[PDB]
Amino acid sequence: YNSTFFSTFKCYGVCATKLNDLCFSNVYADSFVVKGDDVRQIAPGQTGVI
Amino acid sequence: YNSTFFSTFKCYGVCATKLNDLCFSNVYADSFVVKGDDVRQIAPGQTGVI
Numbered sequence: 001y002n003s004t005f006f007s008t009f010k011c012y013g014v015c016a017t018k019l020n021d022l023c024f025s026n027v028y029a030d031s032f033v034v035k036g037d038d039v040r041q042i043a044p045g046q047t048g049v050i
Numbered sequence: 051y052n053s054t055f056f057s058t059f060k061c062y063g064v065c066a067t068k069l070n071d072l073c074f075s076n077v078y079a080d081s082f083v084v085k086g087d088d089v090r091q092i093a094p095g096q097t098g099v100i
């Protein structure tokens with residue numbers, strides 16, 4: 001909370017508020033770098049070059 | 051429509067087009083200042099420092 005601030009944070013299939021008191025079975029993290037106008041393409045049902 | 055212009059304006063419960071033709075009961079205004087990427091936390095069902 002006092003180090004990193006996110007311009008985008010959105011969750012699908014769950015709610016963010018419940019994330020504190022819920023336990024997850026298998027978790028994977030995928031990481032990369034895009035430009036700003038492409039950050040809206042990382043979502044289900046989108047089209048574009050990314 | 052002449053001086054003040056808003057980057058964010060979102061209504062919950064009603065339609066903005068129906069903001070006219072309608073007459074309200076008990077209106078309260080809460081005012082504060084945040085930074086640029088915290089404005090997306092002022093919504094129902096959000097998590098974060100704000």
Ligand SMILES: CCCCC/C=C/C/C=C\CCCCCCCC(=O)O
Pocket residue numbers: 006009019027029097098099
């Ligand atoms: C990367 C290790 C954890 C991986 C599994 C995560 C489980 C919990 C789900 C989401 C929490 C990730 C960080 C969310 C930060 C919110 C920041 C904010 O909105 O202000």
Ligand SMILES: *[C@@H]1O[C@H](CO)[C@@H](O)[C@H](O)[C@H]1NC(C)=O
Pocket residue numbers: 002
């Ligand atoms: C917040 O950041 C400052 C920066 O030095 C650090 O000293 C402090 O420990 C941080 N807060 C917490 C709770 O660690």
Ligand SMILES: *[C@@H]1O[C@H](CO)[C@@H](O)[C@H](O)[C@H]1NC(C)=O
Pocket residue numbers: 052
């Ligand atoms: C809108 O703003 C301009 C800026 O000075 C002003 O001249 C004009 O009278 C304003 N319109 C109205 C209806 O007051």
